[PDB]
Amino acid sequence: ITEGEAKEFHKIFTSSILVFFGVAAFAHLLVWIWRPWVPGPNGY
Amino acid sequence: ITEGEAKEFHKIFTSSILVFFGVAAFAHLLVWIWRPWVPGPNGY
Amino acid sequence: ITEGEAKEFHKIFTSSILVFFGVAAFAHLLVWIWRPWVPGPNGY
Amino acid sequence: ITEGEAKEFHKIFTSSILVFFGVAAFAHLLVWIWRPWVPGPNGY
Amino acid sequence: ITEGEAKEFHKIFTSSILVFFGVAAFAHLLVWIWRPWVPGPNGY
Amino acid sequence: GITEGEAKEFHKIFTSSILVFFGVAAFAHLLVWIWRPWVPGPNGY
Amino acid sequence: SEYQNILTGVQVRTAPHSAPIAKGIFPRLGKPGFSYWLGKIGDAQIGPIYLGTTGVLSLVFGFFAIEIIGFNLLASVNWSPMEFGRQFFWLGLEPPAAEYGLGFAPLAEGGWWQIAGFFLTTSILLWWVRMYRRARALKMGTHTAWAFASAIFLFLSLGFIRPLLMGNFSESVPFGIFPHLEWTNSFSLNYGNFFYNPFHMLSIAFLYGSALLFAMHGATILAVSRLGGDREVEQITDRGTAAERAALFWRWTMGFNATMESIHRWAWWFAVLCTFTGAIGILLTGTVVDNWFEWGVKHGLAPAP
Amino acid sequence: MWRIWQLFDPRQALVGLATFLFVLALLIHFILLSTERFNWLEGASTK
Amino acid sequence: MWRIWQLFDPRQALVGLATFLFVLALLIHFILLSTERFNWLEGASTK
Amino acid sequence: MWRIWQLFDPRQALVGLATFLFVLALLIHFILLSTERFNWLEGAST
Amino acid sequence: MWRIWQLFDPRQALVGLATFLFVLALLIHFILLSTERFNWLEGASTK
Amino acid sequence: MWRIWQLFDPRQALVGLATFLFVLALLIHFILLSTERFNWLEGASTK
Amino acid sequence: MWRIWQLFDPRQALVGLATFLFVLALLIHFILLSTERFNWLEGAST
Amino acid sequence: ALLSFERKYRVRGGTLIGGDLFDFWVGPFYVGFFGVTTLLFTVLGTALIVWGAALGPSWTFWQISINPPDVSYGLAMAPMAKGGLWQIITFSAIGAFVSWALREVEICRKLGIGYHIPFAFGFAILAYVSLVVIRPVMMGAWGYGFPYGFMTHLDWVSNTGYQYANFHYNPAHMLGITLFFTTCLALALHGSLILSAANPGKGEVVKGPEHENTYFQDTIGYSVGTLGIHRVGLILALSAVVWSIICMILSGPIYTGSWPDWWLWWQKLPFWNH
Amino acid sequence: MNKGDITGYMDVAQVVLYAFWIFFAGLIIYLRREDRREGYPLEDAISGKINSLQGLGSVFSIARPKIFKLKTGATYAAPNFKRDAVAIKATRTAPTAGAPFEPTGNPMTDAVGPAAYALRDELPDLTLGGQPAIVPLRVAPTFSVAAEDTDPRGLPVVDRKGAVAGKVTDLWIDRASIAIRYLEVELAATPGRKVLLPFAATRINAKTKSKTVTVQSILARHFANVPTIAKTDSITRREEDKVMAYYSSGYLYSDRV
Ligand SMILES: CCCCCCCCCCCCCC(=O)OC[C@H](COP(=O)(O)OCC(O)COP(=O)(O)OC[C@@H](COC(=O)CCCCCCCCCCCCC)OC(=O)CCCCCCCCCCCCC)OC(=O)CCCCCCCCCCCCC
Ligand code: 07D
Ligand code: 07D
Ligand code: 07D
Ligand SMILES: CC[C@H]1c2cc3[nH]c4c(c3C)C(=O)[C@H](C(=O)OC)c4c3nc(cc4[nH]c(cc(n2)[C@@H]1C)c(C(C)=O)c4C)[C@@H](C)[C@@H]3CCC(=O)OC/C=C(\C)CCC[C@H](C)CCC[C@H](C)CCCC(C)C
Ligand SMILES: CC[C@H]1c2cc3[nH]c4c(c3C)C(=O)[C@H](C(=O)OC)c4c3nc(cc4[nH]c(cc(n2)[C@@H]1C)c(C(C)=O)c4C)[C@@H](C)[C@@H]3CCC(=O)OC/C=C(\C)CCC[C@H](C)CCC[C@H](C)CCCC(C)C
Ligand SMILES: COC1=C(OC)C(=O)C(C/C=C(\C)CC/C=C(\C)CC/C=C(\C)CC/C=C(\C)CC/C=C(\C)CC/C=C(\C)CC/C=C(\C)CC/C=C(\C)CC/C=C(\C)CCC=C(C)C)=C(C)C1=O
Ligand SMILES: COC1=C(OC)C(=O)C(C/C=C(\C)CC/C=C(\C)CC/C=C(\C)CC/C=C(\C)CC/C=C(\C)CC/C=C(\C)CC/C=C(\C)CC/C=C(\C)CC/C=C(\C)CCC=C(C)C)=C(C)C1=O
Ligand SMILES: CCCCCCCC/C=C/CCCCCCCC(=O)O[C@H](COC(=O)CCCCCCCCCCCCCCC)COP(=O)(O)OC[C@@H](O)CO
Ligand SMILES: COC(C)(C)C/C=C/C(C)=C/C=C/C(C)=C/C=C/C(C)=C/C=C\C=C(C)\C=C\C=C(C)\C=C\C=C(C)\C=C\CC(C)(C)OC
Ligand SMILES: [Cl-]
Ligand SMILES: [Fe+3]
């Protein structure tokens, strides 16, 4: 792999990983609003 | 692998491991605040 | 390995093994303070 | 291995084995003081 | 193997068996003092 | 594969060794007999 | 005594080499080694292995399954390494009880067994695709994958397809050494002695026949090995005296014979039919025959009790 | 960070990564279905 | 210390390390799920 | 004692030693988890 | 006794000896953990 | 009897002899641990 | 009778004897341990 | 009739006994003196089986069963109606199988090939002889042999296995099973590889040893090669039989208890016997 | 209970079992067809005319020729229907079809019985690279004997009666299968004559310091009659068959000839 095409792959990789983490973060937020998954002292 | 390549890798590696340990330390702190994992004499 | 590299590796090896044993000794002391592991005649 | 190379290794081996036996002998003494392992006629 | 070399090994071998059997005989003596292993007519 | 005097040499050491081995064994059997003999009488042991 | 050709006395070495395949995402992994004792029985080369996307997939799914099993086994002895070793053969991971049906059970009550079973199943099916695609890459026939499909058919029948027909996993197989033996014992007793299942009888005949055929064929090729008989595909494409005398030994012994190619079809079919008839015998049990001895009494295998 | 793609083949990376992430995602969904609280299809109550 | 990258190939190191750390992490999360106190999905009380 | 690195390859040494120390450490933590007194996750009383 | 290093390679001797002594030590500690008297982690009394 | 070393390689002989003597010693200690009278770790009474 | 060592290889004779005699000796000690009268470790009464 | 290449091999000689008198073919079959004695024992034993079927309660083939004498006879010869029939059939069967092996030797001699096949068949004979002679002799009664009957020999297997609580726990039986499963696996792989090399697919040329080795290197990282696989496949089958024989000589002649209880030695090992 | 029933007596498991028997009979027919791709049709033993006892299954008995495509671009058909000549250098001991043949002359040179061979191609087996597979180590410099083993070269070659036939001068190795296939022996008599010896017809005896290649198959006088090969560095499949058959005949004929 050349430096030129390494740097282009890195750009697309950086964009796609951040979008993947962004969608996953929103999915976790919706699930938390539905049912949180850290129990209190007395449990759920 | 040259000294320059080794030191280039080493500084990026040093950065990545310190990030990983920083996030892990943050995770351990939050879990401890939720439920500590060293029991007292009378247990939990 | 050459004498010079054997001597060199021994320096960094000596530093790191002493760090490893030092951290372990600290870990053992904390665990002993929490719960010692040599029982008396009546047990624990 | 030359004669002198054998004699040199034998020196380092001899100190290493005596140190190993010296630590082990002290460990056995401490364990004996804690709980001896030769039972009398009445057992333990 | 030449005669002198075979005789040299035999000298050290002879010394080693005497040490090994000497230590073992001392071990058996101590074990006999603790609990002998030839039972009398009534057994143990 | 071995010569006459070489077979005789081995035979000499073998003859010594086997007599030593049997001598120790005979001593061992004598001690065991004194402890508990292994030929039962007519009434058994 | 003549040379019996059981072990290679003098063995040769050369630069390790292998047949070319098209470039993939992954090269052939590892540095080829040689071992002396494998070179006495067979070829000495501990060669490289191909990975590929399907190899990655199969190993990842399979590793997860093996971890889920292994972690559950160690958890069942409360993490003790001494009791793990003491109890190892007796430890197992059990399927869910029948009240869960085919839905997800709770993790501790067989949910982990369901996950491990699914991941193991997926890994095995991916390994089938591997065995298939490595043959096509070498421009070879797919016979090995289709033989493997028969073994998989029994494995799936035991673990999943019969549970699907029964509507629950309770009589599926536990992951554990003595536990899967105990399952085998109890399954026979609950359905009235598997000796009276005719498809188990067929499966045994092909199991015995496989050992018969490999004893016959292995001894045959070694008997003609001083005539070049171990070079079987060459003998298939230009019949030598080795293939002629192998044929005539059996013709003169038992009145009939194979060819150098067709004996490998007899071999292929016997080993396949062992597990295929096995799978059918499992799928009929409890679904349409509830007691095989009683079926045997009906169909004349035994006198009325 | 981009130097990683001269150290590793981007195709081998993406295949390994996609394999890992699918198997992990599938494991997590099956784990949640194996629970009372988070099995959304069975839908037990928050008692 | 940087000489370790002369001693070991990073292409082998990072894959071995990534595999090792995942298996360790998976083991620890599984151990916690086996406990009462730390099984977050089951959510037992601390009475 | 530094001559041990003339006797053995540091690359093989560190891989063997790292493997050995991890397996030993993991064994000891599993042993303690199986005890009553030292299972920190269950936390039995003294 | 130094002539034993004319008989044996020091590299082979040390690796074999390290393996032997570790397995022996591990065996002895596991034997003691199987006893009531010497299992230090469970600490039964000397009645 | 030094002629034994003209029959047998002392290196091979010592390795075999050490292996034999270890296995024999290990057998005898395991035998004694099986007895009531000589199991020093359990230490039954000489009633 | 020394001619027997021209007939048989002395090195095979000694290795054969040592193997045979150890296995025979070990058999006889285990036979005695299987008896009440001669099991010296259990030491039953006469 | 003859195969297109057969005539040049049908030479005189190679008999072990009887000379020229028996050295001829009946159609495809070679005769020889051990052919004649094969037929002698075969007809006798078969007709005695059919006689036992006529004596017994049913002609239903599955149910026919010729039974060994009652264990009360010990190793004495029983009356014909009371188990002696099974004893005659047994030794006739031994005669037939031994004759079959020696006839194969004569065929090997005539063809200039090695004796691997009758040698390998000698392990089949030894397994049969173990079950009907050696084990019942060591157990002191012919009545421990298996009955000659389609279902009743399976009933004997069932009864014999459960006599030791659970036969799956016999360690030699586990190893025998492992080798039988491994044999069938190896046969499936071996049949498949030769067929895949000889039948690469339409428009493809026949593949050779390099491809054959490369397939198992690619899939599993090792190839035993074309000579090694026949050595392995033979050794696996013969070892499976040897361990089967051992598992049965253990069960009854030597070990008489529960096989599940035998394994309790493992849990009592001092390094984990808590 | 009605669970499995197809009729009063008939049930699913029984039906499925007969479906297997129908399949298995069809499979045996297929397998027997494949068995008949070499050697068939059968011939009368005396006249060699195409004759055998046959039923109506004769019509399915022999398959249509399959064509193997070889990497040289040649082909092999199976069945090819080629058959051996009816005449051989032997005659029957009695006029019946089942009688054995007695060799007319020296059977080892006449190539009858265990000396007989197949008329294979006058072509060498090839590596995947298209080079001849079986060649002397002289021509395969990348090959070697593994350092753990005895190299056969320079050892005497000895028969079962202790006569020296010659000395080993080369190994012929199979480049495709990576094994020794022959030893090249220079004869003690007519020195400079070289013959191939199949390696599986030998073992190395090393109980005495001057270790030797022992040959059980033939005696020292028979080595002079071992079949010759046309090229000094390659061997055709036919030459391989001819040489290997000759040694395989020794166990029957070497104390006759
Ligand atoms: C006296 C003691 C007698 C003990 C029991 C013996 C049973 C078997 C009978 C053995 C003797 C048969 C003799 C024979 O057929 O000779 C024909 C030949 C004239 O023939 P030809 O002119 O040369 O032409 C013949 C040729 O055209 C036929 O075609 P091809 O050459 O392609 O095939 C040859 C036949 C020959 O077969 C046999 O000889 C018998 C084969 C063995 C049968 C075993 C059956 C029982 C086992 C289980 C079966 C199972 C079937 C499915 O090849 C075949 O037919 C082979 C078929 C193989 C199928 C294998 C299936 C394996 C499945 C295993 C089980 C799996 C279970 C899941 O004869 C002559 O030349 C004239 C002189 C001889 C006259 C013979 C008169 C009849 C003799 C009968 C003997 C008494 C029988 C009770
Ligand atoms: C199906 C179309 C056609 C049809 C007219 C026909 C009929 C009959 N054939 Mg046949 N067969 C046909 C074709 C064909 N055939 C054979 C062979 C054989 C051999 C050995 C194979 C065997 O195990 O058969 C298995 C079954 C198969 C292959 C199906 C046909 C046979 C049946 C249903 C009869 C089974 C019933 C019996 C009581 C047992 C018979 C005796 C023995 C097996 C030893 C054996 C003696 C045999 C018997 C008979 C009989 C009794 C009949 C009757 C009742 O009409 N057949 C094979 C062989 O090697 O022949 C030398 C072979 O190549 C081949 C071919 C292509
Ligand atoms: C009290 C016990 C009772 C008693 C009466 C009796 C006795 C005998 N029986 Mg049986 N058996 C009993 C019960 C019973 N019996 C069987 C089966 C058979 C077949 C198996 C064929 C095979 O290849 O299996 C073996 C092949 C399998 C299971 C399928 C292939 C395996 C695969 C794909 C798995 C691949 C593995 C990995 C990728 C690794 C993953 C790692 C991890 C999980 C950690 C075989 C022929 C056979 C033989 C005999 C004999 C010789 C006897 C004697 C002499 O008594 N028995 C199975 C079956 O097919 O039944 C129809 C089955 O289910 C079942 C049951 C429940
Ligand atoms: C409740 C039952 C219990 C249950 C738990 C269980 C289960 C299983 N077990 Mg088992 N078994 C049990 C009991 C039990 N078990 C065995 C044996 C085995 C062996 C068999 C193969 C063998 O031995 O071939 C030994 C081979 C012989 C005896 C060779 C016989 C053949 C010869 C000489 C030639 C005969 C030729 C003619 C007559 C010619 C006829 C004419 C013409 C064809 C024309 C094998 C390893 C094995 C397999 C499994 C499996 C796979 C399972 C599964 C999946 O559960 N078992 C037998 C043995 O070892 O015998 C030496 C033995 O006696 C015995 C007993 C009593
Ligand atoms: C026709 C019937 C017979 C049969 C046939 C048969 N079996 C077969 C085949 C055939 C024809 C194959 O092609 C196939 C094979 O590959 O053979 C070599 C196979 C096979 N038969 C097998 C077993 C088997 N066969 C058996 C039986 C039989 N096989 C029958 C007798 C039996 C038994 C019980 O009798 C067993 C146990 C396998 C050896 C093999 C199929 C292998 C397979 O599917 O593997 C899937 C993958 C795994 C189990 C996972 C392994 C994971 C590793 C631990 C990963 C380590 C490295 C990794 C990089 C780590 C990654 C970690 C990260 C993810 C964190
Ligand atoms: C040792 C490894 C395996 C093996 C090998 C093997 N078997 C062989 C050979 C080899 C190498 C042969 O060369 C030989 C052969 O010719 O094969 C075609 C043979 C053979 N293996 C056979 C069968 C066979 N092998 C079996 C097993 C095995 N054989 C092992 C797994 C089994 C099993 C396990 O069930 C069977 C049934 C035959 C096909 C054949 C031997 C043929 C023979 O001996 O013919 C002459 C004898 C007769 C024609 C009949 C004699 C009849 C007797 C007078 C009466 C017998 C009654 C019997 C005691 C009871 C029957 C009742 C049953 C319900 C129990
Ligand atoms: C390199 O690849 C190889 C091949 O090749 C290229 C092969 O092929 C094979 C072989 C394998 C296969 C072909 C695959 C199929 C095989 C199996 C699945 C294995 C199982 C086998 C069977 C089911 C077949 C079983 C059949 C058998 C055992 C034969 C039964 C036959 C007889 C008992 C008759 C024997 C005949 C004799 C002894 C002499 C001749 C007699 C007769 C023809 C009939 C009877 C006699 C007369 C009529 C007259 C004479 C009588 C006399 C003198 C006596 C009279 C007195 C009396 C009392 C009778 C292999 C291994 C191989 O690796
Ligand atoms: C023309 O010619 C041909 C060749 O050449 C061209 C060939 O080459 C081959 C191919 C054949 C071979 C290379 C050898 C065949 C030999 C055998 C079948 C007999 C011995 C068994 C094996 C070699 C094992 C076969 C299976 C393999 C290699 C695994 C395949 C699968 C994977 C690599 C992935 C998944 C599986 C893994 C990682 C491991 C599977 C497990 C094992 C191999 C067993 C490990 C052991 C245990 C779990 C322990 C069990 C025992 C216990 C607990 C108690 C006793 C203790 C022990 C330690 C044993 C053929 C067929 C051929 O036609
Ligand atoms: C028409 C008027 C009459 C005039 C004509 C009279 C004269 C002519 C008669 C010939 C028949 C007799 C010879 C039979 C053998 C002839 C050859 C033969 O194999 O024939 C088959 C029947 O075989 C056979 O039954 C051979 C059978 C041999 C074994 C017999 C055993 C019987 C005893 C045990 C029984 C119980 C067992 C236990 C059961 C549970 C039928 O053909 P089929 O195409 O399939 O062949 C295959 C071939 O064509 C493929 O190339
Ligand atoms: C990391 O270090 C190591 C590797 C040492 C960790 C330790 C590992 C160990 C020691 C592992 C030990 C494993 C053992 C002893 C395994 C024994 C396994 C045996 C003997 C298994 C035998 C048979 C099992 C069978 C046939 C099971 C088949 C199950 C199947 C096919 C199940 C399929 C389930 C499906 C498809 C589920 C579907 C339902 C879904 C998931 C869709 O909904 C609930
Ligand atoms: Cl051999
Ligand atoms: Fe083959």
What span, in angstroms and rounded, lies between the C-alpha atoms of O152 and O215?
A: 13
Phi, psi of A43, rounded to the nearest 5 degrees? 80, -160
Residue partners of D7: CB distance under 8 A and separation at least 6: K2
Say if CB G133 and CB G58 are below 8 A apart.
no
What span, in angstroms and rounded, lies between the C-alpha atoms of O184 and O169?
A: 6
Annotated binding site of E for a bacteriochlorophyll: 10, 28
Q: What is the DSSP string of N87-100?
A: HHHHHHHHHHHHHH
Q: Residue B24, SS3?
A: helix
Token duo for residue G26: 């992954």
What span, in angstroms and rounded, lies between the C-alpha atoms of G242 and G227?
A: 5
For helices H10-33 and G111-137, give the axis angle rounded to 10 degrees.
150
Phi, psi of N142, rounded to the nearest 5 degrees? -60, -30
Q: Resolution, rounded to a tenth of an Å?
A: 2.5
Q: 3-state secondary structure string, chain G?
A: CCCCCCCCCCCEECCCCCCCCCCCCCCEECCCEECHHHHHHCCCEECCEECHHHHHHHHHHHHHHHHHHHHHHHHHCCCCHHHHHHHHHHCCECCCCHHHCCCCCCHHHCHHHHHHHHHHHHHHHHHHHHHHHHHHHCCCCCHHHHHHHHHHHHHHHHHHHHHHHHCCCCCCCCECHHHHHHHHHHHHHHCCCHHHCHHHHHHHHHHHHHHHHHHHHHHHHHHCHHHCCCCHHHHHHCCCHHHHHHHHHHHHHHCCCCCCCHHHHHHHHHHHHHHHHHHHHHHHECCCECCHHHHHHHCCCCCCC
Chain B residues whose CB is inside 8 A of the J44 CB are: 39, 43
Q: Residue B15, SS3?
A: helix
Say if CB J46 and CB C44 are below 8 A apart.
yes
Q: At CA N134, angle to CA N129 and CA N135, rounded to 5?
A: 110
Locate all alpha helices (DSSP H) within J1-46, ordered by sequence. Answer: 4-7, 10-34
What span, in angstroms and rounded, lies between the C-alpha atoms of N73 and O208?
A: 58
Return the closest-CA partner of residue L39 out of D39, E2, M6, O1: D39
Q: Residue H35, SS3?
A: coil
Q: Which residue of B has its CA nearest to H7?
A: B9
What span, in angstroms and rounded, lies between the C-alpha atoms of O239 and O245?
A: 10
Token duo for residue N82: 């009371």
Q: Nearest C-alpha to atom 15 of ligand 10 is from which residue?
A: G176
In 10 A of CB L2, how many CB atoms? Answer: 17
Say if CB N110 and CB N14 are below 8 A apart.
yes
Q: Residue O60, SS3?
A: helix
Say if CB G76 and CB G176 are below 8 A apart.
no
Residue partners of I33: CB distance under 8 A and separation at least 6: G107, I39, I41, I42
Token duo for residue O193: 């004559």
What span, in angstroms and rounded, lies between the C-alpha atoms of N230 and G150?
A: 23
- The verdict on the CB of residue N35 being under 6 Å from ligand 6 is no
Q: 3-state secondary structure string, E1-44?
A: CCHHHHHHHHHHHHHHHHHHHHHHHHHHHHHHHHCCCCCECCEC
Number of domains in chain G: 2
Amino acid at B19: V
Phi, psi of O174, rounded to the nearest 5 degrees? -95, 110
Interchain proximity A10–H5, CB inside 8 Å: yes
Return the closest-CA partner of residue O140 out of O42, O233, O30: O233
Return the closest-CA partner of residue G189 out of N63, N180, N161, N247: N161
**Alpha-carbon dihedral sign for residues N263, N268, N269, N274:** positive
Length of chain C in residues, anyone? 44
In the numeric block, the tokens 């392995």 are attached to: N232
What span, in angstroms and rounded, lies between the C-alpha atoms of G46 and G301?
A: 51
Residue partners of E28: CB distance under 8 A and separation at least 6: none
Residue partners of E43: CB distance under 8 A and separation at least 6: M43, M44, M45, M46
Q: Which helix (H) or strand (E) holds A22?
A: helix A3-34
Return the closest-CA partner of residue G176 out of G95, G269, G232, G292: G95
- The verdict on the CB of residue O28 being under 6 Å from ligand 2 is yes
Q: Establish whether the linkage from the previous residue to O41 is cis, with ω within 30° of 0.
A: yes
Residue partners of G79: CB distance under 8 A and separation at least 6: I31, J30, J33, J34
Decide if G181 touches N, using CB distance below 8 A: yes
Long-range contacts of O47-55 (CB under 8 A, 24+ apart): O47/O86, O48/N7, O48/O86, O51/N1, O52/N1, O53/N1
* Domain range enclosing G210: 142-305
Which among G2, G47, G143 is the nearest to N192, CB-wise? G143
Say if CB O167 and CB O226 are below 8 A apart.
no
Q: Which residue of G has its CA nearest to J30?
A: G79
Chain L residues whose CB is inside 8 A of the K32 CB are: 41
Say if CB G197 and CB G281 are below 8 A apart.
yes
Q: Which residues surround ligand 11, an ion (CB under 5 A)?
A: G 4, 6
Token duo for residue K2: 């130094």
Token duo for residue G212: 């018969």
User: For residue O7, what is the DSSP state?
Assistant: S
Interchain proximity O96–N24, CB inside 8 Å: yes
What span, in angstroms and rounded, lies between the C-alpha atoms of G126 and G120?
A: 10
What span, in angstroms and rounded, lies between the C-alpha atoms of G67 and G80?
A: 17
- The verdict on the CB of residue I23 being under 6 Å from ligand 5 is yes
CATH number of O90-254: 3.90.50.10
Say if CB N195 and CB G127 are below 8 A apart.
no
N-term to C-term CA, chain C: 52
Q: Ligand 9, from O36, O40, O53: best to mutate by most atoms within 8 Å of Cβ?
A: O53
Q: 3-state secondary structure string, N162-203?
A: HCCCCHHHCHHHHHHHHHHHHHHHHHHHHHHHHHHHHCCCCC
What span, in angstroms and rounded, lies between the C-alpha atoms of K32 and K19?
A: 20
**What are the CA-CA distances from residue J23 to residues J18, J39, O149, O152 (Å)?**
9, 19, 39, 48
What span, in angstroms and rounded, lies between the C-alpha atoms of G212 and G224?
A: 18
User: For residue N19, what is the DSSP state?
Assistant: G
Token duo for residue C2: 């050459």
Return the closest-CA partner of residue G257 out of N10, N31, O57, O32: O32
Please tell me whether B28 is known to bind a ligand. Answer: yes
Token duo for residue D44: 């333990």
Q: Which residue of F has its CA nearest to M32?
A: F38
Say if CB N114 and CB G4 are below 8 A apart.
yes
What span, in angstroms and rounded, lies between the C-alpha atoms of B4 and B29?
A: 37
Amino acid at O98: G
Say if CB O253 and CB O197 are below 8 A apart.
no
How crowded is the C-beta side of N46, counted as CA atoms within 13 Å?
7
Radius of gyration of chain E (CA): 18
What span, in angstroms and rounded, lies between the C-alpha atoms of E36 and E34?
A: 7
Say if CB G290 and CB G284 are below 8 A apart.
no
Question: How many beta-carbon pairs below 8 A join chains G and K?
Answer: 3
- The verdict on the CB of residue O58 being under 6 Å from ligand 9 is yes
User: For residue N257, what is the DSSP state?
Assistant: S
In the numeric block, the tokens 């291995």 are attached to: D1
What span, in angstroms and rounded, lies between the C-alpha atoms of K25 and K17?
A: 12
Q: Residue O88, SS3?
A: coil
Please tell me whether G94 is known to bind a ligand. Answer: no
What span, in angstroms and rounded, lies between the C-alpha atoms of O32 and O25?
A: 11
Ligand 1 shell residues, CB under 6 Å: G 202, 205, 209, 255-256; N 1, 26-28, 39, 42-43; O 28, 36, 42, 52-54
Radius of gyration of chain N (CA): 24
**What are the CA-CA distances from residue O189 to residues G127, G296, O221, O224 (Å)?**
60, 75, 9, 8
Q: Which residue of D has its CA nearest to K8?
A: D1
Amino acid at G267: A
Q: Residue O59, SS3?
A: helix
Q: How far is B42 from chain H (nearest CA, A)?
A: 30
What span, in angstroms and rounded, lies between the C-alpha atoms of O215 and G2?
A: 8
K28 burial level (CB within 10 Å; 0-12, 13-18, 19+) = exposed
What span, in angstroms and rounded, lies between the C-alpha atoms of A43 and A38?
A: 9
Q: Which residues in J have their CB inside 8 Å of a CB on B?
A: 40-41, 43-46
Q: Where exactly are the structural domains of chain B?
A: 1-44
Say if CB G81 and CB J31 are below 8 A apart.
yes
Q: What is the DSSP string of M4-37?
A: HHHHS-HHHHHHHHHHHHHHHHHHHHHHHHTSTT
- Report the phi/psi class of residue K43: left, alpha or beta, with left for phi > 0 and alpha for psi in -120 to 50: left
Q: Which residues in L have their CB inside 8 Å of a CB on K?
A: 10-11, 14, 41-43
In 10 A of CB A39, how many CB atoms? Answer: 19
Rounded to the nearest whole angstrom, what is the distance from the C-alpha of residue G258 to the centroid of ligand 2? 17
Which among C1, C35, C37 is the nearest to J5, CB-wise? C1
In the numeric block, the tokens 């290889």 are attached to: M9
Say if CB N87 and CB N147 are below 8 A apart.
no
Q: Establish whether the linkage from the previous residue to O79 is cis, with ω within 30° of 0.
A: yes
Chain G residues whose CB is inside 8 A of the K34 CB are: 82
Q: Give the number of the atom of ligand 1 that is nearest the alpha carbon of residue G202.
A: 68
What span, in angstroms and rounded, lies between the C-alpha atoms of N216 and N225?
A: 9
Is there contact between N and H if contact means ≥3 C-beta pairs under 8 Å? no
What span, in angstroms and rounded, lies between the C-alpha atoms of O155 and A17?
A: 70
For helices G143-156 and G262-284, give the axis angle rounded to 10 degrees.
20
Q: Which residues in I have their CB inside 8 Å of a CB on B?
A: 1-6, 9-10, 37-38, 46
**What are the CA-CA distances from residue O231 to residues L15, O136, O175 (Å)?**
53, 11, 17
Amino acid at O210: S
Neighbours of chain L (3+ CB pairs under 8 A): D, E, F, K, M
Q: Which experimental method was this entry solved with?
A: cryo-EM
Length of chain J in residues, anyone? 46
In 10 A of CB I39, how many CB atoms? Answer: 16
In the numeric block, the tokens 């297109």 are attached to: N4
Token duo for residue N273: 């016997």
Which among G241, G244, G259 is the nearest to O35, CB-wise? G259
What span, in angstroms and rounded, lies between the C-alpha atoms of J19 and I27?
A: 17
In 10 A of CB O170, how many CB atoms? Answer: 20
In the numeric block, the tokens 């045959």 are attached to: G220
O116 burial level (CB within 10 Å; 0-12, 13-18, 19+) = buried
What span, in angstroms and rounded, lies between the C-alpha atoms of N230 and N208?
A: 17
Q: Ligand 2, from O32, O34, O36: best to mutate by most atoms within 8 Å of Cβ?
A: O32
**What are the CA-CA distances from residue G144 to residues F27, N193, N237, O45 (Å)?**
69, 7, 21, 41
Q: How far is F22 from chain M (nearest CA, A)?
A: 12
In the numeric block, the tokens 């033993």 are attached to: O45
Ligand 3 shell residues, CB under 6 Å: G 66, 120, 124, 151-152, 154-155, 158, 175, 184-185, 187-188, 194-195, 199-200, 203-204, 207, 274-275, 278, 281-282; N 157, 181, 184
What span, in angstroms and rounded, lies between the C-alpha atoms of N107 and N109?
A: 5
Q: What is the DSSP string of C20-43?
A: HHHHHHHHHHHHHHHS--S-BTTB
Q: Nearest C-alpha to atom 39 of ligand 9 is from which residue?
A: N61
- The verdict on the CB of residue N87 being under 6 Å from ligand 6 is no
Q: What is the DSSP string of N22-73?
A: G--EETTEE--HHHHHHHHHHHHHHHHHHHHHHHSS---GGG--B-PPPGGG
Q: Give the number of the atom of ligand 4 that is nearest the alpha carbon of residue N156.
A: 66
What span, in angstroms and rounded, lies between the C-alpha atoms of L11 and L5?
A: 10
How crowded is the C-beta side of N247, counted as CA atoms within 13 Å?
23
Q: 3-state secondary structure string, O214-247?
A: EECCCCHHHHHHCCCCCCCCCCCHHHHHHHHHHH
Amino acid at O193: R
Token duo for residue O111: 């190539």
Q: Where exactly are the structural domains of chain N?
A: 1-163, 164-263
Length of chain F in residues, anyone? 45
What span, in angstroms and rounded, lies between the C-alpha atoms of J36 and O90?
A: 91
What span, in angstroms and rounded, lies between the C-alpha atoms of B32 and I37?
A: 12
How crowded is the C-beta side of J29, counted as CA atoms within 13 Å?
12
Long-range contacts of H8-15 (CB under 8 A, 24+ apart): H8/I11, H9/A1, H9/G25, H10/A1, H10/A9, H10/A13, H11/G25, H12/G25, H12/G26, H15/G25, H15/G53, H15/G56
Q: Ligand 5, from G129, G130, G143, G148: best to mutate by most atoms within 8 Å of Cβ?
A: G148
Q: Which residues in I have their CB inside 8 Å of a CB on G?
A: 23, 26-27, 30-31, 33-34
